[PDB]
Each structure stands twice: as C-alpha cells, then as structure tokens.
Amino acid sequence: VHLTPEEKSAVTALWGKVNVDEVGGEALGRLLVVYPWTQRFFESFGDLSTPDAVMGNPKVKAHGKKVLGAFSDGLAHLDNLKGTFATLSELHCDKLHVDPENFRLLGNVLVCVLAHHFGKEFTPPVQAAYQKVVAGVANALAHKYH
Amino acid sequence: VHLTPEEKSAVTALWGKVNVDEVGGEALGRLLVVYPWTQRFFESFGDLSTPDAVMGNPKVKAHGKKVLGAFSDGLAHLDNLKGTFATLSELHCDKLHVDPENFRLLGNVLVCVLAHHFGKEFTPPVQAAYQKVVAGVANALAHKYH
Amino acid sequence: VLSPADKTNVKAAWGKVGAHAGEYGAEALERMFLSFPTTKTYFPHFDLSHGSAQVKGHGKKVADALTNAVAHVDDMPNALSALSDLHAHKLRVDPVNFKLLSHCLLVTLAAHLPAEFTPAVHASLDKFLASVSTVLTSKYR
Amino acid sequence: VLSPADKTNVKAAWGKVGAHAGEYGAEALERMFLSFPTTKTYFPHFDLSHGSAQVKGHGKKVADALTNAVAHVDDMPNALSALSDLHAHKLRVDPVNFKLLSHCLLVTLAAHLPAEFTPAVHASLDKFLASVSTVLTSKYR
Ligand code: HEM
Ligand code: HEM
Ligand code: HEM
Numbered sequence: 001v002h003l004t005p006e007e008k009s010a011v012t013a014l015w016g017k018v019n020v021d022e023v024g025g026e027a028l029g030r031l032l033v034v035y036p037w038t039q040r041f042f043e044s045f046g047d048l049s050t051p052d053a054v055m056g057n058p059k060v061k062a063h064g065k066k067v068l069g070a071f072s073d074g075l076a077h078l079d080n081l082k083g084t085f086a087t088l089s090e091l092h093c094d095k096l097h098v099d100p101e102n103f104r105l106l107g108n109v110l111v112c113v114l115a116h117h118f119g120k121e122f123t124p125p126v127q128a129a130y131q132k133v134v135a136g137v138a139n140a141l142a143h144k145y146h
Numbered sequence: 147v148h149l150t151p152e153e154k155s156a157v158t159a160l161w162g163k164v165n166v167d168e169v170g171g172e173a174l175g176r177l178l179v180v181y182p183w184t185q186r187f188f189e190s191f192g193d194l195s196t197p198d199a200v201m202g203n204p205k206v207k208a209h210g211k212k213v214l215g216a217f218s219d220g221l222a223h224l225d226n227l228k229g230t231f232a233t234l235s236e237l238h239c240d241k242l243h244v245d246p247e248n249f250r251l252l253g254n255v256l257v258c259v260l261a262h263h264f265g266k267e268f269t270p271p272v273q274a275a276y277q278k279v280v281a282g283v284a285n286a287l288a289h290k291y292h
Numbered sequence: 293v294l295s296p297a298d299k300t301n302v303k304a305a306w307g308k309v310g311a312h313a314g315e316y317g318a319e320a321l322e323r324m325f326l327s328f329p330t331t332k333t334y335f336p337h338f339d340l341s342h343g344s345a346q347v348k349g350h351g352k353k354v355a356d357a358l359t360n361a362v363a364h365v366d367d368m369p370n371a372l373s374a375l376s377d378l379h380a381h382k383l384r385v386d387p388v389n390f391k392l393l394s395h396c397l398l399v400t401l402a403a404h405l406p407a408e409f410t411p412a413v414h415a416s417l418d419k420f421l422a423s424v425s426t427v428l429t430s431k432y433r
Numbered sequence: 434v435l436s437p438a439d440k441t442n443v444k445a446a447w448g449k450v451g452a453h454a455g456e457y458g459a460e461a462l463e464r465m466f467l468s469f470p471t472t473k474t475y476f477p478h479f480d481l482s483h484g485s486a487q488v489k490g491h492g493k494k495v496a497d498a499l500t501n502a503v504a505h506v507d508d509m510p511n512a513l514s515a516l517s518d519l520h521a522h523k524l525r526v527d528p529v530n531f532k533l534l535s536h537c538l539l540v541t542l543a544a545h546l547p548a549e550f551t552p553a554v555h556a557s558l559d560k561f562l563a564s565v566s567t568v569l570t571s572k573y574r
C-alpha cells in the first residue's frame with residue numbers, strides 16, 4: 001500500500017509531536033488489557049493480573065519503548081517497509097513464535113492511543129493515513145513468516 | 147504472493163482436468179447456499195429460495211460459467227494477476243458495488259468444490275498452492291477499489 | 293459475556309456522549325468511509341462527502357440504536373431484534389464490516405471523551421461493541 | 434442458531450466419518466499447517482512433518498472433541514466447557530485461527546465423503562464448525 005505525498009506529510013507531522021517512550025508503554029499496556037490473550041508472550045513481565053497492574057508494570061513500559069522505537073524508525077522509510085522490518089520479521093517468526101495477527105491488534109490500539117492524545121488534531125483524514133501505515137508495518141513484520 | 151515452480155506445475159495440472167463450466171455453476175451455487183447474504187447481488191436471477199432452487203437456477207449456472215472462465219484465464223498469467231484483473235476490479239467497484247470480502251468467500255468455496263471433485267488427488271500440498279492462487283485473485287480484484 | 297463492571301463502564305462512558313451521540317455517529321461513519329473504503333460499497337445511493345445530510349441523518353440513526361442497546365444491555369437481543377432482521381434479510385452487510393464500524397466508534401470516543409476512555413473503559417467498550425455486532429449478525433444464516 | 438435440519442445434517446455427515454475421525458483430524462491439521470503457516474506459531478514444540486506422531490495424536494484429540502460436540506449439539510457450551518477454559522486461559526490461541534482450522538476440516542470432509550457433502554450439508558457443517566469455534570472462544574475476555 002502507498003501513501004500520497006499528502007498522507008506522508010500528515011503522518012510525519014503528527015509523529016513529530018509524539019513521545020515515543022510514553023506512547024509505546026501506553027499502547028502495549030492497552031493491548032494486554034483489551035485483548036488479554038496477548039499476555040501469553042509475557043509471563044516473565046510479572047503481575048499482569050489487573051489493568052492497574054499491567055499499566056504500571058515497569059517491564060511492559062520498557063518493552064513498549066522498544067517496540068515503538070522500532071516503529072518510529074520504520075516511519076523514516078515508508079517506501080521500504082519490507083526491507084526495514086525484515087530482520088525483525090525473521091525473529092518474531094523463528095525465535096519468538098508470535099502469530100502476526102497480534103501485529104494488527106497492536107496497530108489498532110495505537111490508532112486509539114493517538115486519538116486519545118491528540119483529540120481534534122486526529123482528524124478522519126489523519127486517521128486514514130495512520131491506518132495505512134500500521135497495516136503496512138503489520139504486513140512487513142509478517143512477510144518472512146514461513 | 148508467489149508460487150514456487152512446483153506449486154505452479156501443481157496448479158496447472160489439476161486445472162487441466164477441470165470442466166470450467168460445471169465447476170463454475172457449482173461454486174457460485176454453493177456460495178449462495180452457504181453464505182446466503184451473497185444473494186443480495188442476484189435479485190434478477192429468480193427463485194433462490196432453497197438449495198435445490200439455487201443449484202438448479204439457469205441464470206446462476208450461466209454466471210458461474212462466466213466468473214470461472216475469467217479466473218481460468220487468470221491462471222495463464224499468475225505472474226501478472228493485478229494487470230489481468232484490473233478492468234474487472236474497476237467494474238466490481240465502480241458499477242456493481244461488490245464488497246471484496248465476497249471474493250475471499252468465493253475463493254474458499256472453490257477450494258471445497260475442487261476437494262469434492264478430485265478427492266485424494268487434492269492433496270495437502272495441492273490445496274496449499276490453490277489457497278495462494280485464490281488469495282492472489284481476490285487481492286487483484288480488490289486492488290483498484292477506491 | 294459482559295460482566296457487571298463492563299456494564300457500569302459502558303453505561304457511564306455512553307452517558308457522557310449524551311446529546312452529541314448524533315454528532316459522534318456521523319463522525320464515526322466518516323472515519324469508516326475514509327479508512328476502510330470497501331464499506332462505501334454498501335452506500336452507493338448516498339453522497340458520502342464531508343458534511344453530507346445523508347451521513348448526518350444515518351449517524352443519528354446508528355447512535356440512537358446504540359443508546360437503546362445501552363439502556364437494555366441485559367437483554368440486547370430482544371431490543372435490537374428488528375434491526376437484526378433488517379441487516380440479515382434486506383441490507384445483508386457482510387459480517388466482516390461490523391468490526392470496521394466498531395473500531396471507528398472507539399476512535400471517535402477516544403478523541404472526544406479522553407478522561408473517560410481509560411484502559412478498563414476501552415476494554416468494556418470493545419466488548420460491548422463486539423456484542424452489539426453479534427446480535428446484529430445472529431440471523432444471517 | 435442451528436436449525437433442526439442442520440442438526441440432522443451434522444449428525445449424519447459426522448456419523449459417516451465414524452472410525453476415521455482420528456485420521457481426518459490429523460489430515461485437517463496437516464492441511465492447516467501447509468495452507469496457513471502462521472498457525473504453526475502455536476506448535477513450536479511439535480515435529481510438524483508429514484506422518485508425525487504428535488500431529489497424529491493431536492488430530493485424534495481434536496476429532497474426539499468434535500464427536501462429543503456432535504453428540505451434545507443441543508447443549509454444546511456445557512459439553513465443551515473445559516476445553517474452552519483451556520483455550521482461553523492457557524493456550525490463548527488468537528480467535529482468528531478457529532476459522533482457519535474450520536475451513537481445513539470442511540476440505541478434508543469434502544475430499545473423503547463427497548456423496549454426503551451436498552450443498553445443504555456443506556452449509557450445515559459450516560454453521561456447526563463456526564458455532565464450536567464460538568463456544569471455544571467464549572471465555573477469552
Ligand atoms: C510494531 C509492532 C512490533 C514491533 C516494531 C516490534 C519490535 C520488537 C523489537 C524491536 C523487539 C526487540 C527484539 C530485539 O531487540 O532483538 C521485540 C521483541 C519482542 N516482541 Fe515485538 N514488535 C512488535 C509487535 C509485537 C507484538 C504485537 C507482540 C506480542 C504481543 C510482540 C512480541 C514481542 C516479544 C515477546 C518480544 C520478545 C520479548 C522479550 O524480548 O523479552 N511484538 N519486538
Ligand atoms: C473470481 C472471482 C470473480 C471473477 C473472476 C468475476 C468475474 C466476473 C465477470 C467476468 C463478470 C462479467 C462482467 C462483464 O462481462 O462485463 C462479473 C459480473 C458480476 N460479478 Fe463478478 N467475478 C467474481 C466474483 C464475484 C463475486 C464473489 C460476486 C458477488 C457475490 C460477483 C458479483 C458479480 C455480479 C453481481 C456481476 C454482475 C452480474 C450480472 O452481470 O448480471 N462476482 N464478474
Ligand atoms: C454498530 C453497528 C451498526 C448499527 C448499530 C447499525 C444500525 C443501523 C440503523 C439503526 C439503521 C437504520 C435502519 C432503519 O432506518 O430502520 C441501519 C441501516 C443501515 N445500515 Fe446498519 N448498523 C450497524 C452496522 C452497519 C455496517 C457495518 C454497515 C455497512 C458497512 C451498515 C449498513 C447499513 C445500511 C446500508 C443501512 C441502510 C442505509 C440507508 O439506506 O439509509 N450497518 N443500520
């Protein structure tokens with residue numbers, strides 16, 4: 001999927017206002033709360049028993065920082081998302097065994113977290129550019145699954 | 147998505163044994179019986195009230211012949227499915243308004259109809275090559291939806 | 293199953309929407325048409341421009357349906373029955389699309405009611421909209 | 434809802450499977466692993482080769498579960514309860530995948546039992562497997 005020059009500008013300017021550390025912690029916690037089966041991957045993280053436990057877990061906040069840092073560097077290469085996310089696709093499949101459906105779930109939680117933070121600035125057109133971007137990143141993470 | 151040289155050979159040899167007229171009538175009738183909301187597109191066809199009505203409707207058998215003839219010519223160009231199905235993508239979107247989800251439903255009914263007809267010849271590997279082929283055709287029919 | 297706390301969460305988020313329920317339905321629809329353009333295949337007879345009267349009126353109808361689902365959340369099948377007959381026998385919207393409109397409703401509420409849209413509330417709303425979707429496709433086959 | 438005729442259809446298709454139910458489960462699994470390779474992410478601890486003992490044993494367990502769902506088709510939640518707890522609290526298979534295993538079960542039955550697999554039977558089996566899937570994800574959230 002491709003972005004018009006105008007969808008690209010849109011995306012790049014909102015992202016310039018995003019604290020990638022805090023929004024990554026927030027998106028990953030929401031994913032564990034809203035789709036609780038995603039917690040199967042994070043037995044080592046500790047107490048994930050309740051929404052306040054999950055949203056205040058230090059190890060969940062640190063993994064979100066890492067996941068959203070990688071995404072954030074994807075956004076510098078929207079032309080080449082499959083080469084950018086290729087080593088990571090390989091790891092998620094070969095070493096972590098993560099079903100790629102989880103990548104689409106995370107993508108939708110992140111759109112909700114962006115909405116929540118920017119409000120009126122997260123217009124129907126800016127949402128449409130981010131929906132294309134998160135589907136592209138989910139597709140490049142799944143491309144190299146065998 | 148791409149086919150290995152061996153998946154291509156697989157596909158091409160089974161198709162060489164397919165009566166495209168009868169299998170098209172059969173796949174489209176099964177689609178109307180198994181997912182009855184697909185009948186919204188075919189009010190002109192007549193009595194679609196029961197499975198025997200649907201499976202014996204002359205206008206449904208003639209539309210299946212036409213749909214599966216176009217598919218069958220797709221199979222001569224597996225390298226270039228998006229250029230092959232581009233005019234048709236345009237028509238389904240602009241003039242017929244068919245949600246592209248229906249293309250994926252049809253693809254799965256056709257795999258079941260191929261199973262039913264070939265039996266033991268429709269091996270797990272040959273099924274896997276056809277699943278890739280019908281997803282490719284569904285994606286090329288939906289590519290040009292705006 | 294919606295838990296007693298889900299129900300309380302849903303009753304209080306939706307209570308804050310209040311008299312903007314019209315406005316929020318029209319906005320969720322517009323979001324759905326731009327983000328998932330295959331949903332427009334069901335509205336060939338509408339002007340789908342921004343500000344459109346048809347979308348404004350239809351967003352009001354969809355929001356008043358959800359308000360009533362919320363008022364009758366312990367008995368939603370009976371309350372949405374007519375609407376479910378309508379979707380299954382006339383409109384015949386493919387079931388895959390209720391997820392799409394469900395996601396754009398959550399985005400609209402995240403954007404308008406952020407103090408309310410906590411992680412526990414987000415989770416209760418996602419379950420509630422998945423469940424409305426289920427009642428509305430229950431008579432398809 | 435499964436109609437009385439759906440139930441009769443399902444009871445008689447599945448009755449023809451009989452003592453091959455083991456064999457058919459193992460084959461449906463193998464079909465699922467080749468056609469949808471993201472499902473293998475749930476079996477990292479299995480040899481997924483053709484002929485594999487692990488897949489043969491697991492196909493038998495899955496088929497005997499369906500045989501029991503068929504024997505108790507007017508009360509499937511109660512009959513599959515333990516299994517649904519298992520999928521929701523331990524295995525935590527994403528719900529999207531029950532459709533995948535459901536499609537490969539239909540292909541296996543189309544291929545082995547064609548005289549039975551009429552359009553009305555195909556429609557009853559698709560509804561029955563969608564409904565087993567629903568009971569098995571009913572406790573996820
Ligand atoms: C945009 C989506 C994603 C990106 C960009 C991403 C990126 C990353 C990165 C960078 C790592 C670090 C691996 C390393 O540094 O070698 C990682 C590890 C991991 N990811 Fe992902 N990831 C994504 C989505 C997810 C999702 C949705 C799940 C599961 C729910 C997941 C599960 C994991 C797990 C389990 C690990 C290993 C955890 C650990 O290191 O202890 N990832 N991911
Ligand atoms: C492989 C999938 C498909 C192919 C290759 C295909 C191909 C065709 C072709 C060739 C036509 C003739 C149009 C013309 O000759 O100008 C057509 C018309 C049509 N198709 Fe499709 N089609 C496919 C799937 C479907 C599905 C799944 C639906 C709906 C359930 C659908 C609905 C229709 C309708 C409503 C028409 C017009 C019917 C009419 O002409 O009266 N198609 N399609
Ligand atoms: C929460 C989910 C939904 C609710 C609550 C809902 C509710 C409604 C309501 C109240 C109406 C008006 C019926 C009447 O006037 O009697 C309706 C009509 C309609 N709905 Fe749904 N709906 C939902 C999902 C969808 C989806 C996902 C689609 C398509 C993508 C859709 C397509 C339509 C269409 C095409 C009409 C007729 C529009 C017209 O001609 O005015 N609905 N729906």
Ligand code: HEM
Pocket residue numbers: 472475476491494495498499516519520524526530531534565566569
């Ligand atoms: C009709 C759908 C399904 C049925 C009837 C079913 C039934 C079963 C049964 C009976 C077991 C064995 C539980 C036990 O020994 O106590 C089980 C285990 C398992 N199921 Fe499911 N299942 C279904 C769908 C799925 C799907 C779609 C997946 C993954 C894609 C899956 C993954 C597993 C796994 C990983 C186990 C544990 C395997 C092991 O370690 O032996 N199941 N299922």
